[PDB]
Ligand binder design. Sequence first.
Ligand SMILES: Nc1nc2c(ncn2[C@@H]2O[C@H](COP(=O)(O)OP(=O)(O)OP(O)(O)=S)[C@@H](O)[C@H]2O)c(=O)[nH]1
Ligand SMILES: O=S([O-])[O-]
Ligand SMILES: [Mg+2]
Length: 320
Amino acid sequence: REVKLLLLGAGESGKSTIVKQMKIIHEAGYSEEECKQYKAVVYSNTIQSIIAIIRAMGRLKIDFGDAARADDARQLFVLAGAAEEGFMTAELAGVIKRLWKDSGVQACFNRSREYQLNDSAAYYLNDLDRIAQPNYIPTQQDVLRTRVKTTGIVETHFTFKDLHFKMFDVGGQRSERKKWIHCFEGVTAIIFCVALSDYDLVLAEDEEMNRMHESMKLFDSICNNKWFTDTSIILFLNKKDLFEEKIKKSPLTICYPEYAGSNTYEEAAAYIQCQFEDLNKRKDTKEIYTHFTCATDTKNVQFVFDAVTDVIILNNLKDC
Ligand SMILES: Nc1nc2c(ncn2[C@@H]2O[C@H](COP(=O)(O)OP(=O)(O)OP(O)(O)=S)[C@@H](O)[C@H]2O)c(=O)[nH]1
Ligand SMILES: O=S([O-])[O-]
Ligand SMILES: [Mg+2]
Protein backbone atom coordinates (compact mmCIF):
# COMPACT_ATOMS: atom_id res chain seq x y z
CA ARG A 1 0.00 0.00 0.00
CA GLU A 2 1.02 3.56 -0.91
CA VAL A 3 1.94 6.63 1.13
CA LYS A 4 2.43 10.04 -0.56
CA LEU A 5 4.62 12.48 1.42
CA LEU A 6 4.98 16.09 0.35
CA LEU A 7 7.93 18.18 1.60
CA LEU A 8 7.13 21.84 1.95
CA GLY A 9 8.84 24.84 3.49
CA ALA A 10 10.81 27.98 2.56
CA GLY A 11 14.05 28.11 0.67
CA GLU A 12 17.00 26.18 2.27
CA SER A 13 14.87 24.68 5.04
CA GLY A 14 16.25 21.16 4.44
CA LYS A 15 13.65 19.47 2.22
CA SER A 16 16.02 18.01 -0.33
CA THR A 17 18.36 16.82 2.39
CA ILE A 18 15.54 14.72 3.89
CA VAL A 19 15.02 13.19 0.35
CA LYS A 20 18.71 12.25 0.31
CA GLN A 21 18.47 10.59 3.71
CA MET A 22 15.71 8.33 2.44
CA LYS A 23 18.15 6.93 -0.12
CA ILE A 24 20.80 6.47 2.53
CA ILE A 25 18.53 4.90 5.18
CA HIS A 26 16.14 2.83 3.04
CA GLU A 27 18.14 2.17 -0.17
CA ALA A 28 21.66 1.50 1.09
CA GLY A 29 23.29 4.79 0.26
CA TYR A 30 24.89 6.56 -2.61
CA SER A 31 27.11 4.31 -4.73
CA GLU A 32 30.68 5.29 -5.69
CA GLU A 33 29.44 6.44 -9.13
CA GLU A 34 26.60 8.42 -7.60
CA CYS A 35 29.00 9.99 -5.11
CA LYS A 36 31.36 10.99 -7.91
CA GLN A 37 28.50 12.90 -9.56
CA TYR A 38 28.38 15.18 -6.53
CA LYS A 39 32.13 15.94 -6.63
CA ALA A 40 31.68 19.00 -8.81
CA VAL A 41 28.78 20.14 -6.57
CA VAL A 42 31.05 19.88 -3.50
CA TYR A 43 33.84 21.84 -5.27
CA SER A 44 31.35 24.42 -6.58
CA ASN A 45 29.82 24.88 -3.18
CA THR A 46 33.34 25.27 -1.62
CA ILE A 47 34.48 27.81 -4.19
CA GLN A 48 31.28 29.76 -4.08
CA SER A 49 31.41 29.94 -0.27
CA ILE A 50 34.91 31.37 -0.03
CA ILE A 51 34.09 33.79 -2.92
CA ALA A 52 30.96 34.86 -1.04
CA ILE A 53 32.97 35.71 2.06
CA ILE A 54 35.57 37.55 -0.04
CA ARG A 55 32.74 39.51 -1.81
CA ALA A 56 31.33 40.44 1.58
CA MET A 57 34.69 41.75 2.84
CA GLY A 58 34.44 44.42 0.10
CA ARG A 59 30.87 45.33 1.03
CA LEU A 60 31.59 45.46 4.79
CA LYS A 61 35.08 47.01 4.36
CA ILE A 62 37.01 44.23 6.09
CA ASP A 63 40.72 43.97 5.44
CA PHE A 64 42.68 40.75 5.14
CA GLY A 65 44.47 40.03 8.43
CA ASP A 66 47.71 39.41 6.43
CA ALA A 67 48.52 41.46 3.30
CA ALA A 68 50.03 38.38 1.65
CA ARG A 69 46.46 37.12 1.20
CA ALA A 70 45.73 39.72 -1.46
CA ASP A 71 47.75 37.72 -3.97
CA ASP A 72 46.04 34.49 -2.85
CA ALA A 73 42.68 36.12 -3.58
CA ARG A 74 43.91 37.09 -7.04
CA GLN A 75 44.99 33.49 -7.66
CA LEU A 76 41.61 32.19 -6.36
CA PHE A 77 39.89 33.67 -9.38
CA VAL A 78 42.59 32.58 -11.84
CA LEU A 79 42.28 28.97 -10.57
CA ALA A 80 38.56 28.76 -9.66
CA GLY A 81 37.36 27.64 -13.06
CA ALA A 82 38.82 24.15 -12.55
CA ALA A 83 36.74 23.42 -9.42
CA GLU A 84 33.65 24.30 -11.27
CA GLU A 85 34.52 21.39 -13.68
CA GLY A 86 35.28 18.84 -10.98
CA PHE A 87 38.93 19.37 -10.52
CA MET A 88 40.70 20.55 -7.38
CA THR A 89 44.43 21.07 -7.67
CA ALA A 90 46.80 21.17 -4.69
CA GLU A 91 47.57 24.73 -5.66
CA LEU A 92 43.93 25.85 -5.56
CA ALA A 93 43.40 24.03 -2.29
CA GLY A 94 46.41 25.83 -0.79
CA VAL A 95 45.07 29.18 -1.84
CA ILE A 96 41.62 28.48 -0.34
CA LYS A 97 43.13 27.10 2.87
CA ARG A 98 45.25 30.20 3.46
CA LEU A 99 42.31 32.48 2.75
CA TRP A 100 40.04 30.52 5.09
CA LYS A 101 42.59 30.73 7.91
CA ASP A 102 43.08 34.49 7.60
CA SER A 103 41.74 36.50 10.53
CA GLY A 104 39.96 39.04 8.32
CA VAL A 105 38.24 36.28 6.34
CA GLN A 106 37.21 34.73 9.66
CA ALA A 107 35.90 38.09 10.95
CA CYS A 108 33.75 38.31 7.80
CA PHE A 109 32.64 34.66 8.14
CA ASN A 110 31.42 35.39 11.64
CA ARG A 111 29.21 38.15 10.28
CA SER A 112 27.50 36.00 7.66
CA ARG A 113 23.95 36.99 8.73
CA GLU A 114 24.80 40.32 7.06
CA TYR A 115 25.02 38.57 3.65
CA GLN A 116 24.10 35.24 2.02
CA LEU A 117 26.38 32.29 2.82
CA ASN A 118 25.72 28.59 2.39
CA ASP A 119 25.22 26.74 5.64
CA SER A 120 27.77 24.11 4.60
CA ALA A 121 30.50 26.69 4.05
CA ALA A 122 32.45 25.85 7.23
CA TYR A 123 31.84 22.13 6.77
CA TYR A 124 33.60 22.06 3.45
CA LEU A 125 36.20 24.75 4.12
CA ASN A 126 37.30 23.01 7.37
CA ASP A 127 37.69 19.79 5.37
CA LEU A 128 39.83 21.05 2.49
CA ASP A 129 42.71 18.64 2.95
CA ARG A 130 40.28 15.75 2.72
CA ILE A 131 38.28 16.92 -0.30
CA ALA A 132 41.37 18.03 -2.21
CA GLN A 133 42.93 14.50 -2.11
CA PRO A 134 43.75 12.90 -5.46
CA ASN A 135 40.87 10.72 -6.45
CA TYR A 136 38.66 12.25 -3.74
CA ILE A 137 35.21 10.59 -3.67
CA PRO A 138 32.51 12.43 -1.72
CA THR A 139 31.30 10.73 1.40
CA GLN A 140 27.63 10.25 2.27
CA GLN A 141 27.88 13.29 4.54
CA ASP A 142 29.55 15.33 1.79
CA VAL A 143 26.56 14.50 -0.47
CA LEU A 144 24.08 15.44 2.29
CA ARG A 145 25.88 18.71 2.81
CA THR A 146 25.60 19.86 -0.81
CA ARG A 147 23.39 22.83 -1.69
CA VAL A 148 21.59 23.16 -4.99
CA LYS A 149 18.33 25.20 -5.17
CA THR A 150 15.42 22.95 -6.23
CA THR A 151 13.64 24.34 -9.27
CA GLY A 152 11.33 21.59 -10.38
CA ILE A 153 9.32 18.88 -8.59
CA VAL A 154 11.34 15.84 -7.58
CA GLU A 155 9.70 12.45 -6.99
CA THR A 156 11.51 9.64 -5.19
CA HIS A 157 10.23 6.17 -4.26
CA PHE A 158 11.27 3.77 -1.54
CA THR A 159 9.94 0.88 0.52
CA PHE A 160 9.84 0.89 4.36
CA LYS A 161 7.73 -1.09 6.87
CA ASP A 162 6.10 -2.88 3.87
CA LEU A 163 4.78 0.46 2.61
CA HIS A 164 5.55 1.98 -0.79
CA PHE A 165 6.43 5.63 -0.19
CA LYS A 166 6.30 8.27 -2.88
CA MET A 167 8.07 11.39 -1.62
CA PHE A 168 7.73 14.71 -3.40
CA ASP A 169 10.12 17.65 -3.09
CA VAL A 170 9.61 21.12 -4.52
CA GLY A 171 11.57 24.37 -4.26
CA GLY A 172 10.75 26.74 -1.44
CA GLN A 173 12.11 30.05 -2.71
CA ARG A 174 9.49 32.62 -3.76
CA SER A 175 10.08 31.93 -7.48
CA GLU A 176 9.05 28.30 -6.97
CA ARG A 177 5.99 28.74 -4.69
CA LYS A 178 3.60 28.85 -7.65
CA LYS A 179 4.47 25.21 -8.34
CA TRP A 180 3.43 23.83 -4.94
CA ILE A 181 -0.17 23.36 -6.03
CA HIS A 182 0.88 20.80 -8.66
CA CYS A 183 1.64 18.46 -5.75
CA PHE A 184 -1.52 18.95 -3.73
CA GLU A 185 -3.51 15.85 -4.76
CA GLY A 186 -3.64 12.61 -2.70
CA VAL A 187 -1.20 13.67 0.01
CA THR A 188 -1.01 11.29 2.98
CA ALA A 189 1.21 13.67 4.99
CA ILE A 190 3.01 16.97 4.61
CA ILE A 191 6.45 17.27 6.13
CA PHE A 192 6.81 21.00 6.59
CA CYS A 193 10.45 21.96 7.15
CA VAL A 194 11.61 25.03 9.09
CA ALA A 195 15.23 26.07 9.49
CA LEU A 196 15.49 26.90 13.20
CA SER A 197 18.76 28.72 12.56
CA ASP A 198 17.18 31.10 10.07
CA TYR A 199 15.76 33.36 12.80
CA ASP A 200 18.45 36.06 12.32
CA LEU A 201 18.73 35.72 8.51
CA VAL A 202 16.99 37.51 5.63
CA LEU A 203 15.66 35.97 2.44
CA ALA A 204 18.03 35.48 -0.45
CA GLU A 205 15.08 36.72 -2.58
CA ASP A 206 14.36 39.78 -0.44
CA GLU A 207 16.78 41.35 2.03
CA GLU A 208 14.00 43.17 3.89
CA MET A 209 12.21 39.94 4.94
CA ASN A 210 13.25 37.89 7.97
CA ARG A 211 13.54 34.21 6.95
CA MET A 212 11.66 32.86 9.92
CA HIS A 213 8.77 35.30 9.46
CA GLU A 214 8.50 34.02 5.87
CA SER A 215 8.42 30.46 7.13
CA MET A 216 5.66 31.33 9.61
CA LYS A 217 3.48 32.82 6.86
CA LEU A 218 3.89 29.69 4.75
CA PHE A 219 3.08 27.38 7.63
CA ASP A 220 -0.05 29.43 8.55
CA SER A 221 -1.16 29.05 4.92
CA ILE A 222 -0.58 25.29 4.67
CA CYS A 223 -1.63 24.12 8.17
CA ASN A 224 -4.96 26.02 7.96
CA ASN A 225 -5.82 25.19 4.32
CA LYS A 226 -9.04 23.17 4.47
CA TRP A 227 -7.92 21.16 1.47
CA PHE A 228 -5.49 19.53 3.95
CA THR A 229 -7.99 18.93 6.78
CA ASP A 230 -7.40 15.16 6.62
CA THR A 231 -3.75 15.25 5.59
CA SER A 232 -1.36 14.73 8.51
CA ILE A 233 0.79 17.79 9.19
CA ILE A 234 4.29 16.95 10.34
CA LEU A 235 6.46 19.90 11.40
CA PHE A 236 10.23 19.37 11.21
CA LEU A 237 12.00 22.13 13.18
CA ASN A 238 15.27 21.45 11.37
CA LYS A 239 18.92 22.68 11.62
CA LYS A 240 18.82 22.06 15.36
CA ASP A 241 22.62 21.60 15.28
CA LEU A 242 23.18 25.03 13.77
CA PHE A 243 20.59 26.55 16.06
CA GLU A 244 22.27 25.16 19.17
CA GLU A 245 25.44 27.04 18.26
CA LYS A 246 23.75 30.26 17.04
CA ILE A 247 21.44 30.76 20.00
CA LYS A 248 24.54 31.13 22.22
CA LYS A 249 25.51 34.37 20.41
CA SER A 250 22.75 35.83 18.25
CA PRO A 251 19.70 37.19 20.09
CA LEU A 252 16.34 35.56 19.30
CA THR A 253 14.78 39.01 19.72
CA ILE A 254 16.04 39.80 16.19
CA CYS A 255 13.06 37.69 15.13
CA TYR A 256 10.71 37.77 18.11
CA PRO A 257 11.15 41.01 20.04
CA GLU A 258 8.89 39.77 22.89
CA TYR A 259 11.03 36.72 23.65
CA ALA A 260 12.01 36.91 27.31
CA GLY A 261 13.86 33.59 27.66
CA SER A 262 17.60 32.95 27.88
CA ASN A 263 20.15 32.42 25.08
CA THR A 264 19.88 28.66 25.47
CA TYR A 265 18.72 25.83 23.29
CA GLU A 266 15.77 24.33 25.19
CA GLU A 267 13.94 27.54 26.07
CA ALA A 268 14.41 29.12 22.69
CA ALA A 269 13.56 25.95 20.73
CA ALA A 270 10.34 25.53 22.69
CA TYR A 271 9.48 29.20 22.12
CA ILE A 272 9.85 28.83 18.36
CA GLN A 273 7.79 25.61 18.45
CA CYS A 274 5.05 27.49 20.22
CA GLN A 275 5.12 30.36 17.69
CA PHE A 276 4.53 27.93 14.85
CA GLU A 277 2.02 25.70 16.62
CA ASP A 278 0.03 28.78 17.70
CA LEU A 279 -0.67 29.48 14.02
CA ASN A 280 -3.05 26.49 13.96
CA LYS A 281 -6.56 28.02 13.95
CA ARG A 282 -8.24 24.68 14.80
CA LYS A 283 -6.22 23.35 17.74
CA ASP A 284 -8.85 20.90 18.91
CA THR A 285 -9.53 19.28 15.54
CA LYS A 286 -6.13 19.49 13.76
CA GLU A 287 -3.01 17.91 15.30
CA ILE A 288 0.52 19.00 14.39
CA TYR A 289 3.18 16.30 14.80
CA THR A 290 6.37 18.27 15.68
CA HIS A 291 9.93 16.87 15.63
CA PHE A 292 13.24 18.64 16.05
CA THR A 293 15.66 17.45 13.42
CA CYS A 294 19.15 17.73 11.98
CA ALA A 295 18.52 16.65 8.42
CA THR A 296 22.16 16.04 7.63
CA ASP A 297 22.48 13.61 10.61
CA THR A 298 21.44 10.13 9.32
CA LYS A 299 20.97 8.66 12.79
CA ASN A 300 18.68 11.47 13.85
CA VAL A 301 16.60 11.32 10.70
CA GLN A 302 16.42 7.53 10.89
CA PHE A 303 14.87 7.55 14.38
CA VAL A 304 12.67 10.55 13.70
CA PHE A 305 11.41 9.09 10.39
CA ASP A 306 10.76 5.74 12.17
CA ALA A 307 8.58 7.60 14.70
CA VAL A 308 6.84 9.58 11.94
CA THR A 309 6.13 6.42 9.92
CA ASP A 310 4.56 4.72 13.00
CA VAL A 311 2.16 7.59 13.37
CA ILE A 312 1.22 7.54 9.66
CA ILE A 313 0.67 3.76 9.83
CA LEU A 314 -1.71 4.25 12.79
CA ASN A 315 -3.60 7.28 11.41
CA ASN A 316 -3.76 6.93 7.68
CA LEU A 317 -3.50 3.36 6.66
CA LYS A 318 -6.37 1.41 8.17
CA ASP A 319 -7.88 -1.23 5.93
CA CYS A 320 -11.65 -0.97 5.85
N1 LIG B 1 24.07 21.60 9.47
C1 LIG B 1 22.90 21.35 8.86
N2 LIG B 1 22.76 21.56 7.55
C2 LIG B 1 21.61 21.33 6.95
C3 LIG B 1 20.48 20.79 7.72
N3 LIG B 1 19.49 20.64 6.87
C4 LIG B 1 19.94 21.03 5.68
N4 LIG B 1 21.21 21.43 5.71
C5 LIG B 1 21.99 21.96 4.60
O1 LIG B 1 21.42 23.21 4.18
C6 LIG B 1 21.46 23.37 2.78
C7 LIG B 1 20.03 23.48 2.20
O2 LIG B 1 19.26 22.33 2.36
P1 LIG B 1 18.27 21.84 1.25
O3 LIG B 1 17.98 20.50 1.59
O4 LIG B 1 18.92 22.12 0.01
O5 LIG B 1 17.07 22.86 1.39
P2 LIG B 1 15.73 22.87 0.54
O6 LIG B 1 14.72 23.09 1.50
O7 LIG B 1 15.70 21.72 -0.27
O8 LIG B 1 15.88 24.21 -0.27
P3 LIG B 1 15.14 24.72 -1.60
O9 LIG B 1 15.36 23.62 -2.60
O10 LIG B 1 13.66 24.93 -1.25
S1 LIG B 1 16.14 26.38 -2.15
C8 LIG B 1 22.21 22.16 2.26
O11 LIG B 1 23.57 22.54 2.18
C9 LIG B 1 22.00 21.13 3.37
O12 LIG B 1 23.08 20.29 3.47
C10 LIG B 1 20.67 20.58 9.15
O13 LIG B 1 19.77 20.20 9.84
N5 LIG B 1 21.87 20.93 9.60
O1 LIG C 1 3.76 32.72 -6.28
S1 LIG C 1 3.13 33.71 -7.18
O2 LIG C 1 3.90 33.86 -8.41
O3 LIG C 1 1.78 33.30 -7.57
MG1 LIG D 1 15.49 21.52 -2.34
